[PDB]
Subunit: 313 residues, 4 copies
């Protein structure tokens, strides 16, 4: 461990939190009213160590939607249940060339990776096939509860309804993937879209999410229950792709400067993993031009430059 005194570490998290707090730039997402509602001043950071030690500061009990933060989690589930090889017959393993989610496939007509919409849509089609959407949803909720050691995991029906109604681009992607035969045989593509919108609409708090991150940090064992949630293979794949593909078009800079597996989402969440050390969830709705939470980005840079957490430190 690189944290001898947890309490002193705590004291530093608070200092970084406080420094990030002064960063007021960015714009709260407003493509649906359920995101536009949110106050720009909301800002929470929660830590859950591999030990099971906890620390929160700021708004760490206000629920918000995982949104793209869910992409690594459902990917992790797919690999856990199906293994690396099956999953990757359907989706690639690396950063899309140009901009994030520009609607195309790789040389093999597979979405580039699970962290872009096309890829997450396909991953969604792989999970618990055969059963109805209601059972699919329950199965995943249950899985996230395990990842979160039974802490806050809810569902925003209003976000779901708005996502489905306004999600023209995701429908375009759905039909495109159908044309290119990207789904396993017998897939109801529209039903898969619905399931996808639902998954984006799952709600968490910084506190519960940090436990999910910590489970990934802990080889797939939930640090506050001790139970095995994910296969080692699942964790490793997920971390690799979070490392390279997790921060939209900022993934490259993030890997270089921060060097940690992370996944941002349009609600302003940033799911952060320090392998063998801790999980974290940082949350603040206002987003930069690349769609990453302004405060969270700032906090991540400061955290690594302070605690020498970079992959290659």
């Amino acid at each position: 461990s690189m944290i001898p005194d947890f309490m002193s570490f705590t004291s530093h998290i608070d200092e970084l939190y406080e420094s990030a707090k002064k960063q007021s730039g960015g714009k709260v997402a407003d493509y649906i009213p359920q995101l536009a509602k949110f106050s720009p001043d909301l800002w929470g950071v929660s830590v859950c160590t591999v030990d099971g030690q906890r620390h929160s500061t700021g708004d760490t009990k206000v629920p918000f939607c995982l949104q793209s933060c869910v992409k690594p989690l459902k990917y992790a589930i797919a690999v856990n249940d199906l293994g690396t090889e099956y999953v990757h017959r359907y989706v690639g393993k690396e950063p899309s060339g140009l901009r994030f989610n520009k609607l195309f496939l790789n040389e093999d007509d597979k979405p580039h990776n699970p962290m872009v919409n096309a890829g997450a849509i396909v991953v969604t089609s792989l999970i618990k096939q055969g059963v109805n959407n209601a059972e699919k949803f329950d199965y995943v909720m249950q899985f996230l509860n395990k990842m979160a050691g039974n802490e806050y995991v809810g569902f925003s029906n209003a976000t779901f309804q708005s996502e489905r109604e306004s999600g023209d681009r995701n429908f375009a992607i759905g039909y495109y993937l159908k044309e290119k035969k990207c789904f396993p045989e017998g897939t109801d593509m529209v039903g898969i879209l619905d399931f996808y919108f639902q998954l984006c609409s799952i709600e968490v708090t910084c506190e519960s999410a940090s436990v999910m991150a910590a489970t990934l940090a802990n080889g797939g064992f939930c640090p506050i229950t001790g139970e095995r949630v994910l296969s080692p293979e699942a964790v490793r794949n997920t971390l690799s792709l979070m490392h390279s593909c997790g921060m939209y078009d900022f993934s490259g800079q993030f890997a270089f400067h921060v060097g940690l597996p992370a996944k941002s989402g349009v609600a302003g969440g940033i799911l952060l993993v320090v392998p063998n050390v801790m999980g974290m969830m940082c949350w603040s709705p206002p987003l930069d031009k690349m769609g990453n939470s302004v405060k969270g980005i700032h906090f991540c840079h400061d955290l690594v430059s302070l605690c020498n957490f970079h992959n290659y430190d």
Copy 2:
């Protein structure tokens, strides 16, 4: 006129027809059974001069679907009813860079031109807005009857039903254009898709189609009725775009070597215009790798190399 003796010209058309007939390569389209049905050996050529003189050879009374051959016709209708400026607020004026129908927009987020699917879908949304799809369809059928001087214009319901069921790519394009706000306000995109599939499913014969081509060749006046069908502006726009965008990825080579406005379709039709001389429709189901009728392409090359019909001869 560049045809002093029509009868002698006739005799030459027959020779070219006969030479093209020996070209057996290519593949009949089979993405729907309504296209796969067709015999590879079907081959017709019909001419209608600006004078109103007629000549057919081969299978010139077997109905087949316009398919993309309809794109210039509905574009012509849009401009006729709405003028160049309005239409082109919605669709561009030039060859898409890369491959034909690769799903993207130009710098202004407009489809590149009316001869690609995205562009024709948008053009379809412009026609007779406000009225229901049934009236839209009738209005256009009536318009084509005028273009064809009341000769064969029918409708393939089976093609329509199959186009809608198998048209995932067109649905992707529909949703993409909706996301990018490419349609006039208050557009039912799905309804527009339906209308689009219907238009592709309109049936003609070489004989009736050649009269449509001749109307374009004749400044928008139907050479066998004498009535004005299209505005001069409409004809000129349509010819310009047929010249540069009408033969899929072969448009460039076709312009260079043949130099005539034309529009191919997946049923194997090639609508050909010799400005101020005649209209023609050539038809043969087997298509080359670029989607153009093998016999028709061969015939077009021979026709120009013989009668010096090239734009810049």
Copy 3:
């Protein structure tokens, strides 16, 4: 002929000239001092009919460099001496997809067409192979004299020297084409670049250039000498490509709205052809964002909208 009274036509040219004159926008090219020198207020239009009738207005005797205006001319020479088939083993036949001169090749690793730099560089390598650069240059000067019926054809040594010194992009293209084996065996690529810079540096006046344009308008016969300068094949190819590829990224709009073969150049020249009617050269140094002379573009639009000269009028 579409010009019954030449004198009345003359009177109209003057009106259009005068209207264009009020268009003061645009920027004189300044990448070399030899272009930056030029006054923005210079503006000339010269007409030479297929008959041999002449008319000039404004600054039609001030020499300026052909620059890219030379591309169609040397292409025409290559085809004249070597035939279509040989030339096009080396260069394509159609508009490059994206922006003009973005440095790449087509599917067959050939430059897209002769009107872009990569293509003109290759065309230059085809002309009078075997002889030294001095003889190559003389041969071409002589050819242009024939095209111009012995009117002004000079050479700007200062432009040449500056083009070679500042032409890093053309050197990059030279080496790229060498890597991809785009030149005939035994080509001195650097020497070909030199020759290319020289050709760009050939000087003309509106008056002499319009005779060159008129020769193209007249099936390759110089209207003021009556001698055959270019093969019919050469003229037709050149016109086709001028039609589609001649106005940089504005080629598409120009074809649609004007419908005439033309070729612009960075000195502000626009070589215009009205097939079977006349040649023209319009010249005014200030260029729009696409590199086309602002006054010339304006004048071309007005000319067609007035005299119904559009290809498909």
Copy 4:
């Protein structure tokens, strides 16, 4: 440490070596005779731990050229002498979108990263500016000697001469970067190319190279001399970019499946780093379709799947 018994580890390296040995596919590079000379059956693996423990098997004393293996090393030197911020004013920080070395720049007109040719060419221009090429070369040779703890570092004059004569693509890149102003003011671009060719032509053995790799594995301290060669910042940057950009178009798959910083080269070398554990150099001339040594790739996969060396194991 994850190696308790070095001798037992040794025994396993030998087993993997032996297994890789049976992989006979791939093609020895032949774009210059100096590469084509090499036997396909040559195959060496050398390990140098952070401890300073050593082990070799196979052809680990036959000199070969670093080629692209040098890219991370000179990048490391640039950052060491100039700091991250200066270096990255000139070159980017992340994987190029499409194929490796396809000749273009990022949004800011900088080469995408130091591991592609355009980027390494620019990095080369940054080193020891002001002094002549001879001193530049000596300075770097001296630096590599330090990295290698004074083991084999030579120079292939024949490779240099052939690289310069056949390097048309690199010259194209040189001129392109000059046009786009990618070099620090006052750069002799041609001289920089020369220097670049020289650096590619530096010779090493598996044994000496593994010590260079080990220096990177050891926070920039040479494990067999104990001296500080590189700044911590330099090492971390280099490792990050090796991780994401080091294996040409295979970088994505390599990161996912192997999860180690590596850099391949066309001579068949693969410079491998296991942070805080060891450096390795694997070498075998025959390359796969992506330009990576067939045996080395195979060996790397097996090594991680055996010793759990993956970044996220």
